[PDB]
Point group: C3
Chain length 272, copies 3
Amino acid sequence: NGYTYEDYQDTAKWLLSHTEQRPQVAVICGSGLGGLVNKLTQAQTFDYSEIPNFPESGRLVFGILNGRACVMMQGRFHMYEGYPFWKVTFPVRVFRLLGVETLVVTNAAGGLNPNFEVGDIMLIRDHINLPGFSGENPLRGPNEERFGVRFPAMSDAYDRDMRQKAHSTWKQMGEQRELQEGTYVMLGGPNFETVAECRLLRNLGADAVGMSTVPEVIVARHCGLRVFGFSLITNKVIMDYKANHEEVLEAGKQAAQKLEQFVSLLMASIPV
Amino acid sequence: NGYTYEDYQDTAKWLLSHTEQRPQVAVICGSGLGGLVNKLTQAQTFDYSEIPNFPESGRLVFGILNGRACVMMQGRFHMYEGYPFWKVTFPVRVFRLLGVETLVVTNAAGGLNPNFEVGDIMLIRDHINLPGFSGENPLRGPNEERFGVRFPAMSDAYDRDMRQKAHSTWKQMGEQRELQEGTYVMLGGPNFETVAECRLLRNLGADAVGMSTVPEVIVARHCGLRVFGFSLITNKVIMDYKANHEEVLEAGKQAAQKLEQFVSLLMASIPV
Amino acid sequence: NGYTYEDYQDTAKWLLSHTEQRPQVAVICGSGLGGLVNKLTQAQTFDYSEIPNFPESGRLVFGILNGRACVMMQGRFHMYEGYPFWKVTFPVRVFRLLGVETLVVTNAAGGLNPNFEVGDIMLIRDHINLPGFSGENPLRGPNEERFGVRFPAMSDAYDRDMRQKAHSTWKQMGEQRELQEGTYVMLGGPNFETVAECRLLRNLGADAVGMSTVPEVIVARHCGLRVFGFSLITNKVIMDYKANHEEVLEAGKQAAQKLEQFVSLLMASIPV
Ligand SMILES: Nc1nc2c(ncn2[C@@H]2O[C@H](CO)[C@H]3O[C@H](P(=O)(O)O)O[C@H]32)c(=O)[nH]1
Ligand SMILES: Nc1nc2c(ncn2[C@@H]2O[C@H](CO)[C@H]3O[C@H](P(=O)(O)O)O[C@H]32)c(=O)[nH]1
Ligand SMILES: Nc1nc2c(ncn2[C@@H]2O[C@H](CO)[C@H]3O[C@H](P(=O)(O)O)O[C@H]32)c(=O)[nH]1
Ligand SMILES: [Mg+2]
Ligand SMILES: [Mg+2]
Ligand SMILES: [Mg+2]
Ligand SMILES: [Zn+2]
Ligand SMILES: [Zn+2]
Ligand SMILES: [Zn+2]
């Protein structure tokens, strides 16, 4: 944490005086998932570059989505860019200081579970934090009690109530493909995995693999936010003897109409 | 290593001129295990803050325990506090420069082995250093030959002679519960593990999980110290679909009379 | 990357003006494998200390090997020495700027596969990057497009064509022992592994374990180099309840006549 408690306060104060919007829910939009901001009403956008203390990516968009006041991150930060986790997760603590109570995290991931198929939406039921095993953690350093406790529990990170609400909502949508669920594993990147690494990750119990999200979830739970999230399976990883960026980028627009409807409906029952 | 060889020497010299005690054994007391210092005779305490070069935690207590001259660390340092391993392990090299020959390391840990039960004492037979897999190691950097070799072996870290002496001593005590043995795995922390992570760690062959000890053992072996250690199982980790700090704190006082007797008896046969 | 693009250019320019040699192949010689430079004709050596920007180890030797113009690293750099991966891999990008098209990487490793025997040569078919799981990666930071893409694929890192050429060449040599193949796993070091760690690594699917190579391969693939490599199995790791440096050093001279012949023949078919 290269930021003082006051830095977070200064940023939150700036945002509160520049918009009349007062979000109750924050949504972090992953790779190729930034199209959700388009459905917001009474929207107000701020490029990250205009906000004091924000890291370099992207923009923050406030607005109303299906009755709920939200704030969305159009673009996120990654460890592979050279940013320490205290920079990657800066926005999460700011959201808490704005009065946000729930965080929705989304991402694009590679499918490790053999039953998954391209286009599947996997509700995140749990995660595996590989960088955390070695000490790379956003909570490393002196603990700030004004945010949370020294040793936070992480076994109940993904809200059970919201996950059931998610399944009920997916049923009302009348989708032919079942809503998937699984464990998300995060690794640093930026290179893609070798076959041997993919086999290993699957045997660790992982269903999907990506390069983000886990740090943000840990910080959100530390400061008391309710957490819900999902992965868009953009490709099936090969487990025997290639993957590119445009593949995940194309897959993004592929299931755009699907994700937008889903997230919009979930706002109805969060709750408040 | 942000410390010069001279820094270690300066600290050892300070200690040698401020107490007449000349310890042969050093004991690092973990979470809720600091009550052992109470049985020391001719004791002398120094807060870490009074000792030149010591990291910030805690106190060092010299004294006689059941016939043996000892020095105990009442409180230790952790990677999750933001300290590099060269700071976490500073005391170990100082002990070597004082003439200490044996290091006893203790800690509180979560039980991964299904047969373990709360209150069990697990002798550490081996360990798994996860942070070490990624390069986070107290020996990283130029090697100081005055302490040890460039590529130290770690497969024989936990002295076999002492482990058998430990079992014989535990038998003379007449305990109803058998003395457990197992592999300790260290992860960075400070958050507690998710269910998926717990399942993974068990399949890696780990019997107990914690956030310390391994760095100190590696440094002790590098500089030639005999090593012995154990974990107090404060709780059984859940492997299916919470843990707090006061749970391990309460469990500490729970088996206080047990640990104190055990450690005191082990001093009898170390040997000298 | 603490180096600017210009730094790489300055170093490459220095080398190009100090030798008439123009290598097409670069070979990194591992522990006890530096004897290959002896067969070079029209050789020219530069201690790393004479080359602007080079890290501290060792020497670079240019020359002709069995008809092919080569440049060899007599000694490499390791993460355990305290060097970040951007320093460890500096030479690889310089080689690309010299016009090198293929990189041959060699190392000494511990055998995890039960069928391996001391003296065996294991062709590297794939790898597992443990430090990479936690973010320690030579590509971490802003991406330099003049070298490669932001998200490079790594599943096809070890050239299939060269691996088959390797097997054909090994057959013409008339060796009694078959040429082995397997997955190489890299860990930080400098201490050697415990029994519990060895068992774990084997279950991850690793056949050989060492403290180098992976970073260099990742950087080579990022900048477009064809990659081929192998490990000299210097010892069989114990999987039940010691290893030193002179053991791998002695094993090096043991299979010197073997490795030298093999590498020399492979130059014939790389191709050009
Ligand atoms: N590590 C990894 N990432 C993958 C794979 N398939 C898709 N991804 C996505 O590729 C992207 C890079 O092309 C990664 O970042 C994004 P996000 O976490 O910002 O939403 O998700 C990741 C994959 O197979 N492995
Ligand atoms: N990582 C981890 N640590 C645990 C668990 N159960 C008990 N612990 C203990 O919780 C403590 C934090 O509440 C950790 O530090 C101490 P020590 O290593 O300083 O003796 O041991 C650790 C557990 O389930 N996981
Ligand atoms: N990590 C590890 N390294 C081993 C083992 N057996 C041999 N090695 C070699 O010991 C050497 C240290 O004695 C390591 O560095 C060299 P190189 O990567 O520079 O070629 O290879 C490594 C082994 O069992 N484990
Ligand atoms: Mg700014
Ligand atoms: Mg001080
Ligand atoms: Mg120089
Ligand atoms: Zn203004
Ligand atoms: Zn004094
Ligand atoms: Zn000159």
